[PDB]
Amino acid sequence: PAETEYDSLYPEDD
Amino acid sequence: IVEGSDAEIGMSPWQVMLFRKSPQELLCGASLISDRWVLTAAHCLLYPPWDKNFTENDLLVRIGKHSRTRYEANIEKISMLEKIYIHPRYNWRENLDRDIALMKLKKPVAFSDYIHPVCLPDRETAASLLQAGYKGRVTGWGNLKETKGQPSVLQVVNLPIVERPVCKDSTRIRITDNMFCAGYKPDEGKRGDACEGDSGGPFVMKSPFNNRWYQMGIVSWGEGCDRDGKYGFYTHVFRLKKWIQKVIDQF
Amino acid sequence: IVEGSDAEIGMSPWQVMLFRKSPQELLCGASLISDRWVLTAAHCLLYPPWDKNFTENDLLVRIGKHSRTRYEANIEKISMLEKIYIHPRYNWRENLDRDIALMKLKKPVAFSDYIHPVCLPDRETAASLLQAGYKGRVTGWGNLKETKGQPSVLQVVNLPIVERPVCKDSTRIRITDNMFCAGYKPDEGKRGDACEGDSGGPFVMKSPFNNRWYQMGIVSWGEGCDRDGKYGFYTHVFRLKKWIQKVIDQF
Amino acid sequence: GEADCGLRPLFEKKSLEDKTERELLES
Amino acid sequence: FGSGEADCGLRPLFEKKSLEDKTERELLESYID
Ligand SMILES: *[C@@H]1O[C@H](CO)[C@@H](O)[C@H](O)[C@H]1NC(C)=O
Ligand code: NA
Ligand code: NA
């Protein structure tokens, strides 16, 4: 099971 | 690797063995993604619960190996570590989430028939291949069972990606989006799994769009080896690819 | 409990069942040490990796039970929790060191033929009975195997304490002096172990000096259930007795 | 003197032994 | 600035030699049965 969305490295969203 | 089978020569040229220097010991699997970079799990380099806290000098890697019970001269290569990079959000103080790490080699290894880099998934590959039922390949020199018991030749096994809800209900352990699980279900007739010594190794898939091999996961963890109702967990490589690219570009 | 056997009525009158209220669920074992206090493992009340973080109201305990598939009227008793006390230096992040917790009951339970407190060890009992080879008794309602599978009657098994060196080398997990291990060695003929559901339960021994039963351990953790080469680990109750006495005296 | 702890009403208190305590004593 | 190098994922002793390994077919057949 997996998504094509990346894991965030921050604090500094959209 | 439990319930796997011998691998053909040159079948996994990006396979990498991570060794503790002294006492000499096979610690984990790893993969070659370029002539100077090796990918592996972070828990293989840093995991205090097992009093595992390594620095570049404690370690070493062997690339291009096929059989342990033999020194393939002019074939296998050894490389020292220049720098270890553990994922910034990796926190051993829980879950093993973001269990990925890079290792810059002191000197670039020469590619050959038996040594060759694997690819990192592009969005298309991840979008279409990361689905329940699709099989990937896990390879390594880890234990042959959860109990010699150590292979002489690289082992290999193909396992199907499991539906997230099934992974979730298969363990009391909270799992995250940065992990996916693989393994046959109880009563699928088939078996196979990674075992101690395989962690950090790659979970690859062959793209039917361009015939290239892509590393979708990194053997991360499991409760036991090849137990019915349990599945192996893998670091979702694509989700963490930006970090990988950041490190390699910036260093 | 794996490879154990049915227990006789009134054989372990200090046995306590810890239940999650909703969904109704047997969470762990526990022991009665007085009419208002129950002893158990801390990881049973607080263990984030399993998203386990209970408060007094989520829980409840049943004392004096023999069979689950039956309501022993006028026999078994239920008690609500007034306060939970986890050991201040309890380490869930690393190796479950100091895995002990106390639970004060809202109301004092009535002793009877089936509900009776167990003794806590004094220095003489601990010094003489905590020897490698000496056997203790582990009891609980946990799984019957590492794979219904859930007993109907309280299970019991006797296990021998193991030399620290064998324990230490039996796992990659760093162990501390606040825990001791128990279980038969591979090829001793016998087997047995605690399994998921027995945690927090007591490991008792009968003093040959005053014929009283003393709880020397608390089922804590293990890698699987009844595997060859592996042993179950227990919270060394004596080493932590001062904390227990502190809590009870001071509250 | 520890209260009555460790003495089971249906065994020690009645001069009776359960089926496996001898296994402990013998160890 | 990099999703798998230029020659990445193409095994010298296999793809490069129009040869297949003993089990790659199993993977290919799992792509939506
Ligand atoms: C890693 O272990 C080393 C060598 O034992 C020690 O000096 C250091 O404190 C450890 N790393 C950290 C900061 O946790
Ligand atoms: Na499995
Ligand atoms: Na065992």
PDB file of all heavy atoms in Angstrom, chain C residues 15-21 25-30 38-41 43-45 52 54 56 58-63 79 81 84 103 141 197 199-200:
ATOM      1  N   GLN C  15      -4.409 -13.755  41.261  1.00  0.00           N
ATOM      2  CA  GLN C  15      -4.432 -13.487  39.830  1.00  0.00           C
ATOM      3  C   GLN C  15      -5.435 -12.377  39.553  1.00  0.00           C
ATOM      4  O   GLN C  15      -6.528 -12.354  40.128  1.00  0.00           O
ATOM      5  CB  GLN C  15      -4.841 -14.740  39.055  1.00  0.00           C
ATOM      6  CG  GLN C  15      -4.531 -14.684  37.571  1.00  0.00           C
ATOM      7  CD  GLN C  15      -3.063 -14.911  37.306  1.00  0.00           C
ATOM      8  OE1 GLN C  15      -2.365 -15.495  38.138  1.00  0.00           O
ATOM      9  NE2 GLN C  15      -2.584 -14.472  36.144  1.00  0.00           N
ATOM     10  N   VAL C  16      -5.053 -11.450  38.681  1.00  0.00           N
ATOM     11  CA  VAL C  16      -5.931 -10.350  38.329  1.00  0.00           C
ATOM     12  C   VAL C  16      -5.942 -10.154  36.823  1.00  0.00           C
ATOM     13  O   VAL C  16      -4.904 -10.247  36.168  1.00  0.00           O
ATOM     14  CB  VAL C  16      -5.474  -9.040  38.984  1.00  0.00           C
ATOM     15  CG1 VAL C  16      -6.386  -7.889  38.543  1.00  0.00           C
ATOM     16  CG2 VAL C  16      -5.475  -9.182  40.494  1.00  0.00           C
ATOM     17  N   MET C  17      -7.126  -9.885  36.282  1.00  0.00           N
ATOM     18  CA  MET C  17      -7.294  -9.645  34.851  1.00  0.00           C
ATOM     19  C   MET C  17      -7.488  -8.154  34.626  1.00  0.00           C
ATOM     20  O   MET C  17      -8.337  -7.538  35.269  1.00  0.00           O
ATOM     21  CB  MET C  17      -8.530 -10.381  34.315  1.00  0.00           C
ATOM     22  CG  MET C  17      -8.443 -11.902  34.361  1.00  0.00           C
ATOM     23  SD  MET C  17     -10.018 -12.753  33.940  1.00  0.00           S
ATOM     24  CE  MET C  17      -9.906 -12.823  32.173  1.00  0.00           C
ATOM     25  N   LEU C  18      -6.699  -7.574  33.726  1.00  0.00           N
ATOM     26  CA  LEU C  18      -6.836  -6.159  33.409  1.00  0.00           C
ATOM     27  C   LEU C  18      -7.581  -6.047  32.086  1.00  0.00           C
ATOM     28  O   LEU C  18      -7.118  -6.534  31.056  1.00  0.00           O
ATOM     29  CB  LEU C  18      -5.469  -5.494  33.277  1.00  0.00           C
ATOM     30  CG  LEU C  18      -5.520  -3.992  32.968  1.00  0.00           C
ATOM     31  CD1 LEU C  18      -6.277  -3.287  34.074  1.00  0.00           C
ATOM     32  CD2 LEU C  18      -4.115  -3.441  32.852  1.00  0.00           C
ATOM     33  N   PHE C  19      -8.725  -5.381  32.115  1.00  0.00           N
ATOM     34  CA  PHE C  19      -9.564  -5.235  30.935  1.00  0.00           C
ATOM     35  C   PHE C  19      -9.722  -3.827  30.424  1.00  0.00           C
ATOM     36  O   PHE C  19      -9.829  -2.886  31.206  1.00  0.00           O
ATOM     37  CB  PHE C  19     -10.974  -5.714  31.246  1.00  0.00           C
ATOM     38  CG  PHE C  19     -11.146  -7.184  31.202  1.00  0.00           C
ATOM     39  CD1 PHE C  19     -10.968  -7.949  32.344  1.00  0.00           C
ATOM     40  CD2 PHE C  19     -11.571  -7.806  30.032  1.00  0.00           C
ATOM     41  CE1 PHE C  19     -11.216  -9.309  32.325  1.00  0.00           C
ATOM     42  CE2 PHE C  19     -11.822  -9.158  30.004  1.00  0.00           C
ATOM     43  CZ  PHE C  19     -11.647  -9.915  31.153  1.00  0.00           C
ATOM     44  N   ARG C  20      -9.753  -3.686  29.106  1.00  0.00           N
ATOM     45  CA  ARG C  20     -10.024  -2.389  28.513  1.00  0.00           C
ATOM     46  C   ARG C  20     -11.564  -2.391  28.556  1.00  0.00           C
ATOM     47  O   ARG C  20     -12.181  -3.415  28.253  1.00  0.00           O
ATOM     48  CB  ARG C  20      -9.564  -2.327  27.055  1.00  0.00           C
ATOM     49  CG  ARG C  20      -9.968  -1.004  26.407  1.00  0.00           C
ATOM     50  CD  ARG C  20     -10.056  -1.016  24.902  1.00  0.00           C
ATOM     51  NE  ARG C  20      -9.011  -0.240  24.321  1.00  0.00           N
ATOM     52  CZ  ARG C  20      -8.972   0.961  23.748  1.00  0.00           C
ATOM     53  NH1 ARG C  20      -9.996   1.788  23.534  1.00  0.00           N
ATOM     54  NH2 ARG C  20      -7.765   1.309  23.352  1.00  0.00           N
ATOM     55  N   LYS C  21     -12.200  -1.287  28.935  1.00  0.00           N
ATOM     56  CA  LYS C  21     -13.663  -1.309  28.997  1.00  0.00           C
ATOM     57  C   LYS C  21     -14.356  -1.436  27.641  1.00  0.00           C
ATOM     58  O   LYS C  21     -15.154  -2.350  27.420  1.00  0.00           O
ATOM     59  CB  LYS C  21     -14.200  -0.073  29.713  1.00  0.00           C
ATOM     60  CG  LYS C  21     -14.001  -0.083  31.222  1.00  0.00           C
ATOM     61  CD  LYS C  21     -14.613   1.161  31.841  1.00  0.00           C
ATOM     62  CE  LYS C  21     -14.424   1.183  33.338  1.00  0.00           C
ATOM     63  NZ  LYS C  21     -14.973   2.440  33.910  1.00  0.00           N
ATOM     64  N   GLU C  25     -12.010  -5.982  26.351  1.00  0.00           N
ATOM     65  CA  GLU C  25     -10.839  -6.708  25.892  1.00  0.00           C
ATOM     66  C   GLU C  25      -9.874  -7.030  27.037  1.00  0.00           C
ATOM     67  O   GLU C  25      -9.587  -6.170  27.873  1.00  0.00           O
ATOM     68  CB  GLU C  25     -10.148  -5.816  24.850  1.00  0.00           C
ATOM     69  CG  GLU C  25      -9.023  -6.405  24.017  1.00  0.00           C
ATOM     70  CD  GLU C  25      -8.292  -5.318  23.212  1.00  0.00           C
ATOM     71  OE1 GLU C  25      -8.957  -4.378  22.716  1.00  0.00           O
ATOM     72  OE2 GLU C  25      -7.050  -5.404  23.070  1.00  0.00           O
ATOM     73  N   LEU C  26      -9.390  -8.271  27.075  1.00  0.00           N
ATOM     74  CA  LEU C  26      -8.419  -8.676  28.086  1.00  0.00           C
ATOM     75  C   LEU C  26      -7.092  -8.087  27.613  1.00  0.00           C
ATOM     76  O   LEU C  26      -6.585  -8.450  26.553  1.00  0.00           O
ATOM     77  CB  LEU C  26      -8.299 -10.199  28.170  1.00  0.00           C
ATOM     78  CG  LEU C  26      -7.197 -10.673  29.136  1.00  0.00           C
ATOM     79  CD1 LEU C  26      -7.568 -10.303  30.568  1.00  0.00           C
ATOM     80  CD2 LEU C  26      -7.009 -12.178  29.027  1.00  0.00           C
ATOM     81  N   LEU C  27      -6.535  -7.170  28.393  1.00  0.00           N
ATOM     82  CA  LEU C  27      -5.292  -6.515  28.024  1.00  0.00           C
ATOM     83  C   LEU C  27      -4.025  -7.134  28.601  1.00  0.00           C
ATOM     84  O   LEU C  27      -3.015  -7.279  27.889  1.00  0.00           O
ATOM     85  CB  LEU C  27      -5.331  -5.047  28.452  1.00  0.00           C
ATOM     86  CG  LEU C  27      -6.354  -4.116  27.808  1.00  0.00           C
ATOM     87  CD1 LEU C  27      -6.455  -2.850  28.645  1.00  0.00           C
ATOM     88  CD2 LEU C  27      -5.945  -3.787  26.374  1.00  0.00           C
ATOM     89  N   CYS C  28      -4.075  -7.500  29.881  1.00  0.00           N
ATOM     90  CA  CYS C  28      -2.890  -8.019  30.553  1.00  0.00           C
ATOM     91  C   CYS C  28      -3.229  -8.798  31.817  1.00  0.00           C
ATOM     92  O   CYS C  28      -4.389  -8.886  32.222  1.00  0.00           O
ATOM     93  CB  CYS C  28      -2.009  -6.832  30.961  1.00  0.00           C
ATOM     94  SG  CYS C  28      -0.956  -6.119  29.669  1.00  0.00           S
ATOM     95  N   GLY C  29      -2.189  -9.346  32.441  1.00  0.00           N
ATOM     96  CA  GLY C  29      -2.357 -10.043  33.695  1.00  0.00           C
ATOM     97  C   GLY C  29      -1.962  -9.011  34.745  1.00  0.00           C
ATOM     98  O   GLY C  29      -1.477  -7.925  34.396  1.00  0.00           O
ATOM     99  N   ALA C  30      -2.160  -9.340  36.014  1.00  0.00           N
ATOM    100  CA  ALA C  30      -1.816  -8.459  37.124  1.00  0.00           C
ATOM    101  C   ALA C  30      -1.933  -9.267  38.413  1.00  0.00           C
ATOM    102  O   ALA C  30      -2.506 -10.357  38.403  1.00  0.00           O
ATOM    103  CB  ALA C  30      -2.780  -7.273  37.170  1.00  0.00           C
ATOM    104  N   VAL C  38      -2.971  -3.454  43.214  1.00  0.00           N
ATOM    105  CA  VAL C  38      -2.731  -4.443  42.176  1.00  0.00           C
ATOM    106  C   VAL C  38      -1.435  -4.087  41.487  1.00  0.00           C
ATOM    107  O   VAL C  38      -1.177  -2.926  41.189  1.00  0.00           O
ATOM    108  CB  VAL C  38      -3.877  -4.455  41.134  1.00  0.00           C
ATOM    109  CG1 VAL C  38      -3.523  -5.371  39.964  1.00  0.00           C
ATOM    110  CG2 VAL C  38      -5.159  -4.918  41.795  1.00  0.00           C
ATOM    111  N   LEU C  39      -0.625  -5.099  41.232  1.00  0.00           N
ATOM    112  CA  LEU C  39       0.670  -4.919  40.594  1.00  0.00           C
ATOM    113  C   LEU C  39       0.583  -5.425  39.158  1.00  0.00           C
ATOM    114  O   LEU C  39      -0.133  -6.379  38.884  1.00  0.00           O
ATOM    115  CB  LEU C  39       1.713  -5.713  41.386  1.00  0.00           C
ATOM    116  CG  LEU C  39       3.177  -5.708  40.979  1.00  0.00           C
ATOM    117  CD1 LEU C  39       3.756  -4.299  41.128  1.00  0.00           C
ATOM    118  CD2 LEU C  39       3.929  -6.717  41.876  1.00  0.00           C
ATOM    119  N   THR C  40       1.301  -4.788  38.243  1.00  0.00           N
ATOM    120  CA  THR C  40       1.272  -5.202  36.844  1.00  0.00           C
ATOM    121  C   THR C  40       2.462  -4.550  36.144  1.00  0.00           C
ATOM    122  O   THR C  40       3.256  -3.868  36.791  1.00  0.00           O
ATOM    123  CB  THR C  40      -0.067  -4.758  36.164  1.00  0.00           C
ATOM    124  OG1 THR C  40      -0.133  -5.273  34.830  1.00  0.00           O
ATOM    125  CG2 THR C  40      -0.163  -3.241  36.103  1.00  0.00           C
ATOM    126  N   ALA C  41       2.599  -4.757  34.837  1.00  0.00           N
ATOM    127  CA  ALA C  41       3.708  -4.160  34.096  1.00  0.00           C
ATOM    128  C   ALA C  41       3.326  -2.745  33.634  1.00  0.00           C
ATOM    129  O   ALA C  41       2.151  -2.471  33.352  1.00  0.00           O
ATOM    130  CB  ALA C  41       4.059  -5.023  32.891  1.00  0.00           C
ATOM    131  N   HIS C  43       4.282  -1.268  30.800  1.00  0.00           N
ATOM    132  CA  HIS C  43       3.995  -1.247  29.366  1.00  0.00           C
ATOM    133  C   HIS C  43       2.537  -1.619  29.058  1.00  0.00           C
ATOM    134  O   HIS C  43       2.065  -1.402  27.942  1.00  0.00           O
ATOM    135  CB  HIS C  43       4.967  -2.156  28.583  1.00  0.00           C
ATOM    136  CG  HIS C  43       4.611  -3.611  28.619  1.00  0.00           C
ATOM    137  ND1 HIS C  43       5.148  -4.487  29.535  1.00  0.00           N
ATOM    138  CD2 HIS C  43       3.726  -4.326  27.888  1.00  0.00           C
ATOM    139  CE1 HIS C  43       4.605  -5.682  29.370  1.00  0.00           C
ATOM    140  NE2 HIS C  43       3.740  -5.611  28.378  1.00  0.00           N
ATOM    141  N   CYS C  44       1.835  -2.181  30.044  1.00  0.00           N
ATOM    142  CA  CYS C  44       0.425  -2.545  29.877  1.00  0.00           C
ATOM    143  C   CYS C  44      -0.459  -1.306  29.980  1.00  0.00           C
ATOM    144  O   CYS C  44      -1.588  -1.290  29.478  1.00  0.00           O
ATOM    145  CB  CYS C  44      -0.025  -3.538  30.960  1.00  0.00           C
ATOM    146  SG  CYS C  44       0.547  -5.251  30.726  1.00  0.00           S
ATOM    147  N   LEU C  45       0.047  -0.276  30.651  1.00  0.00           N
ATOM    148  CA  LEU C  45      -0.723   0.945  30.823  1.00  0.00           C
ATOM    149  C   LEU C  45      -0.232   2.036  29.914  1.00  0.00           C
ATOM    150  O   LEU C  45      -1.005   2.860  29.453  1.00  0.00           O
ATOM    151  CB  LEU C  45      -0.646   1.415  32.271  1.00  0.00           C
ATOM    152  CG  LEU C  45      -1.174   0.367  33.241  1.00  0.00           C
ATOM    153  CD1 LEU C  45      -0.706   0.645  34.651  1.00  0.00           C
ATOM    154  CD2 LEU C  45      -2.687   0.354  33.150  1.00  0.00           C
ATOM    155  N   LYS C  52      -0.774   2.731  23.071  1.00  0.00           N
ATOM    156  CA  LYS C  52      -1.375   2.304  24.324  1.00  0.00           C
ATOM    157  C   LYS C  52      -1.049   3.381  25.365  1.00  0.00           C
ATOM    158  O   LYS C  52       0.103   3.561  25.753  1.00  0.00           O
ATOM    159  CB  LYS C  52      -0.775   0.955  24.726  1.00  0.00           C
ATOM    160  CG  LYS C  52      -1.367   0.335  25.960  1.00  0.00           C
ATOM    161  CD  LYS C  52      -0.625  -0.942  26.334  1.00  0.00           C
ATOM    162  CE  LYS C  52      -0.718  -2.007  25.249  1.00  0.00           C
ATOM    163  NZ  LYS C  52      -2.120  -2.454  25.026  1.00  0.00           N
ATOM    164  N   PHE C  54      -3.436   4.406  28.471  1.00  0.00           N
ATOM    165  CA  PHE C  54      -4.659   4.383  29.248  1.00  0.00           C
ATOM    166  C   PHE C  54      -4.744   5.272  30.468  1.00  0.00           C
ATOM    167  O   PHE C  54      -3.736   5.623  31.076  1.00  0.00           O
ATOM    168  CB  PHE C  54      -4.954   2.950  29.693  1.00  0.00           C
ATOM    169  CG  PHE C  54      -5.177   1.998  28.563  1.00  0.00           C
ATOM    170  CD1 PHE C  54      -4.216   1.053  28.240  1.00  0.00           C
ATOM    171  CD2 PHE C  54      -6.337   2.062  27.803  1.00  0.00           C
ATOM    172  CE1 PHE C  54      -4.406   0.187  27.177  1.00  0.00           C
ATOM    173  CE2 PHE C  54      -6.537   1.198  26.739  1.00  0.00           C
ATOM    174  CZ  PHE C  54      -5.566   0.258  26.423  1.00  0.00           C
ATOM    175  N   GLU C  56      -7.227   5.776  34.157  1.00  0.00           N
ATOM    176  CA  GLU C  56      -8.063   4.996  35.064  1.00  0.00           C
ATOM    177  C   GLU C  56      -9.443   4.592  34.549  1.00  0.00           C
ATOM    178  O   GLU C  56      -9.867   3.445  34.732  1.00  0.00           O
ATOM    179  CB  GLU C  56      -8.257   5.727  36.389  1.00  0.00           C
ATOM    180  CG  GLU C  56      -6.995   5.974  37.201  1.00  0.00           C
ATOM    181  CD  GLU C  56      -6.108   7.055  36.607  1.00  0.00           C
ATOM    182  OE1 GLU C  56      -6.606   7.870  35.793  1.00  0.00           O
ATOM    183  OE2 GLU C  56      -4.910   7.094  36.972  1.00  0.00           O
ATOM    184  N   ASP C  58     -10.584   4.140  31.450  1.00  0.00           N
ATOM    185  CA  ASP C  58     -10.654   3.245  30.301  1.00  0.00           C
ATOM    186  C   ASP C  58     -10.666   1.802  30.776  1.00  0.00           C
ATOM    187  O   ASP C  58     -11.222   0.927  30.117  1.00  0.00           O
ATOM    188  CB  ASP C  58      -9.424   3.392  29.389  1.00  0.00           C
ATOM    189  CG  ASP C  58      -9.206   4.806  28.897  1.00  0.00           C
ATOM    190  OD1 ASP C  58     -10.202   5.489  28.562  1.00  0.00           O
ATOM    191  OD2 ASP C  58      -8.025   5.218  28.823  1.00  0.00           O
ATOM    192  N   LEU C  59     -10.042   1.581  31.931  1.00  0.00           N
ATOM    193  CA  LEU C  59      -9.850   0.251  32.493  1.00  0.00           C
ATOM    194  C   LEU C  59     -10.739  -0.252  33.606  1.00  0.00           C
ATOM    195  O   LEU C  59     -11.552   0.471  34.181  1.00  0.00           O
ATOM    196  CB  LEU C  59      -8.402   0.128  32.959  1.00  0.00           C
ATOM    197  CG  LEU C  59      -7.426   0.676  31.927  1.00  0.00           C
ATOM    198  CD1 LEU C  59      -6.037   0.780  32.526  1.00  0.00           C
ATOM    199  CD2 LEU C  59      -7.438  -0.230  30.704  1.00  0.00           C
ATOM    200  N   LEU C  60     -10.525  -1.528  33.911  1.00  0.00           N
ATOM    201  CA  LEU C  60     -11.252  -2.249  34.935  1.00  0.00           C
ATOM    202  C   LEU C  60     -10.524  -3.572  35.183  1.00  0.00           C
ATOM    203  O   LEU C  60      -9.774  -4.043  34.328  1.00  0.00           O
ATOM    204  CB  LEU C  60     -12.670  -2.476  34.432  1.00  0.00           C
ATOM    205  CG  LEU C  60     -13.491  -3.739  34.637  1.00  0.00           C
ATOM    206  CD1 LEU C  60     -14.858  -3.480  34.025  1.00  0.00           C
ATOM    207  CD2 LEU C  60     -12.854  -4.939  33.971  1.00  0.00           C
ATOM    208  N   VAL C  61     -10.721  -4.162  36.353  1.00  0.00           N
ATOM    209  CA  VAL C  61     -10.071  -5.432  36.646  1.00  0.00           C
ATOM    210  C   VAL C  61     -11.038  -6.447  37.217  1.00  0.00           C
ATOM    211  O   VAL C  61     -11.992  -6.096  37.908  1.00  0.00           O
ATOM    212  CB  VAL C  61      -8.903  -5.284  37.667  1.00  0.00           C
ATOM    213  CG1 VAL C  61      -7.764  -4.507  37.046  1.00  0.00           C
ATOM    214  CG2 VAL C  61      -9.402  -4.603  38.938  1.00  0.00           C
ATOM    215  N   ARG C  62     -10.803  -7.712  36.908  1.00  0.00           N
ATOM    216  CA  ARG C  62     -11.633  -8.778  37.451  1.00  0.00           C
ATOM    217  C   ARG C  62     -10.717  -9.675  38.280  1.00  0.00           C
ATOM    218  O   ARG C  62      -9.649 -10.102  37.827  1.00  0.00           O
ATOM    219  CB  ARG C  62     -12.331  -9.553  36.335  1.00  0.00           C
ATOM    220  CG  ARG C  62     -13.603  -8.861  35.866  1.00  0.00           C
ATOM    221  CD  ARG C  62     -14.435  -9.750  34.959  1.00  0.00           C
ATOM    222  NE  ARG C  62     -14.355  -9.295  33.578  1.00  0.00           N
ATOM    223  CZ  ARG C  62     -15.217  -8.462  33.009  1.00  0.00           C
ATOM    224  NH1 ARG C  62     -16.261  -8.018  33.689  1.00  0.00           N
ATOM    225  NH2 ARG C  62     -15.049  -8.098  31.748  1.00  0.00           N
ATOM    226  N   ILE C  63     -11.134  -9.929  39.513  1.00  0.00           N
ATOM    227  CA  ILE C  63     -10.360 -10.736  40.443  1.00  0.00           C
ATOM    228  C   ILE C  63     -11.151 -11.971  40.853  1.00  0.00           C
ATOM    229  O   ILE C  63     -12.372 -11.921  40.967  1.00  0.00           O
ATOM    230  CB  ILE C  63     -10.039  -9.901  41.700  1.00  0.00           C
ATOM    231  CG1 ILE C  63      -9.438  -8.555  41.278  1.00  0.00           C
ATOM    232  CG2 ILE C  63      -9.100 -10.654  42.615  1.00  0.00           C
ATOM    233  CD1 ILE C  63      -9.364  -7.537  42.380  1.00  0.00           C
ATOM    234  N   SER C  79     -13.431  -4.455  39.957  1.00  0.00           N
ATOM    235  CA  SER C  79     -12.963  -3.292  40.675  1.00  0.00           C
ATOM    236  C   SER C  79     -12.532  -2.223  39.703  1.00  0.00           C
ATOM    237  O   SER C  79     -11.894  -2.510  38.688  1.00  0.00           O
ATOM    238  CB  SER C  79     -11.789  -3.681  41.570  1.00  0.00           C
ATOM    239  OG  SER C  79     -12.149  -4.747  42.432  1.00  0.00           O
ATOM    240  N   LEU C  81     -10.519   1.427  38.861  1.00  0.00           N
ATOM    241  CA  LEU C  81      -9.236   1.988  39.243  1.00  0.00           C
ATOM    242  C   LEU C  81      -9.396   3.386  39.817  1.00  0.00           C
ATOM    243  O   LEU C  81     -10.161   4.190  39.294  1.00  0.00           O
ATOM    244  CB  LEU C  81      -8.316   2.065  38.031  1.00  0.00           C
ATOM    245  CG  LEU C  81      -8.116   0.779  37.244  1.00  0.00           C
ATOM    246  CD1 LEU C  81      -6.835   0.907  36.430  1.00  0.00           C
ATOM    247  CD2 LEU C  81      -8.035  -0.410  38.200  1.00  0.00           C
ATOM    248  N   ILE C  84      -3.521   5.218  38.815  1.00  0.00           N
ATOM    249  CA  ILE C  84      -2.488   4.421  38.183  1.00  0.00           C
ATOM    250  C   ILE C  84      -1.136   5.022  38.563  1.00  0.00           C
ATOM    251  O   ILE C  84      -0.968   6.241  38.560  1.00  0.00           O
ATOM    252  CB  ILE C  84      -2.631   4.465  36.654  1.00  0.00           C
ATOM    253  CG1 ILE C  84      -3.940   3.791  36.241  1.00  0.00           C
ATOM    254  CG2 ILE C  84      -1.441   3.800  35.994  1.00  0.00           C
ATOM    255  CD1 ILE C  84      -4.227   3.879  34.753  1.00  0.00           C
ATOM    256  N   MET C 103      -1.586  -0.119  40.682  1.00  0.00           N
ATOM    257  CA  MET C 103      -2.936   0.379  40.464  1.00  0.00           C
ATOM    258  C   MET C 103      -3.699   0.293  41.777  1.00  0.00           C
ATOM    259  O   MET C 103      -3.877  -0.801  42.325  1.00  0.00           O
ATOM    260  CB  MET C 103      -3.649  -0.451  39.395  1.00  0.00           C
ATOM    261  CG  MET C 103      -2.927  -0.464  38.059  1.00  0.00           C
ATOM    262  SD  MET C 103      -3.834  -1.324  36.770  1.00  0.00           S
ATOM    263  CE  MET C 103      -3.966  -2.984  37.468  1.00  0.00           C
ATOM    264  N   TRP C 141      -4.096 -15.698  31.185  1.00  0.00           N
ATOM    265  CA  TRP C 141      -5.125 -16.082  30.220  1.00  0.00           C
ATOM    266  C   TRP C 141      -4.744 -15.726  28.795  1.00  0.00           C
ATOM    267  O   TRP C 141      -5.586 -15.741  27.898  1.00  0.00           O
ATOM    268  CB  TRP C 141      -6.444 -15.398  30.558  1.00  0.00           C
ATOM    269  CG  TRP C 141      -7.289 -16.166  31.508  1.00  0.00           C
ATOM    270  CD1 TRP C 141      -8.031 -17.275  31.232  1.00  0.00           C
ATOM    271  CD2 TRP C 141      -7.479 -15.882  32.894  1.00  0.00           C
ATOM    272  NE1 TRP C 141      -8.677 -17.702  32.365  1.00  0.00           N
ATOM    273  CE2 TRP C 141      -8.357 -16.867  33.398  1.00  0.00           C
ATOM    274  CE3 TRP C 141      -6.997 -14.900  33.763  1.00  0.00           C
ATOM    275  CZ2 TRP C 141      -8.761 -16.889  34.735  1.00  0.00           C
ATOM    276  CZ3 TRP C 141      -7.400 -14.924  35.093  1.00  0.00           C
ATOM    277  CH2 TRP C 141      -8.274 -15.910  35.565  1.00  0.00           C
ATOM    278  N   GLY C 197      -0.959 -11.413  26.228  1.00  0.00           N
ATOM    279  CA  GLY C 197      -2.161 -11.546  27.025  1.00  0.00           C
ATOM    280  C   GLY C 197      -1.803 -11.893  28.455  1.00  0.00           C
ATOM    281  O   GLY C 197      -2.613 -11.706  29.367  1.00  0.00           O
ATOM    282  N   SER C 199       1.194 -10.723  29.791  1.00  0.00           N
ATOM    283  CA  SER C 199       2.006  -9.612  30.269  1.00  0.00           C
ATOM    284  C   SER C 199       1.409  -8.955  31.511  1.00  0.00           C
ATOM    285  O   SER C 199       0.196  -8.809  31.640  1.00  0.00           O
ATOM    286  CB  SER C 199       2.177  -8.572  29.160  1.00  0.00           C
ATOM    287  OG  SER C 199       2.958  -9.107  28.105  1.00  0.00           O
ATOM    288  N   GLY C 200       2.277  -8.571  32.435  1.00  0.00           N
ATOM    289  CA  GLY C 200       1.819  -7.936  33.657  1.00  0.00           C
ATOM    290  C   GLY C 200       1.459  -8.969  34.694  1.00  0.00           C
ATOM    291  O   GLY C 200       1.315  -8.645  35.873  1.00  0.00           O
TER     292      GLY C 200
END
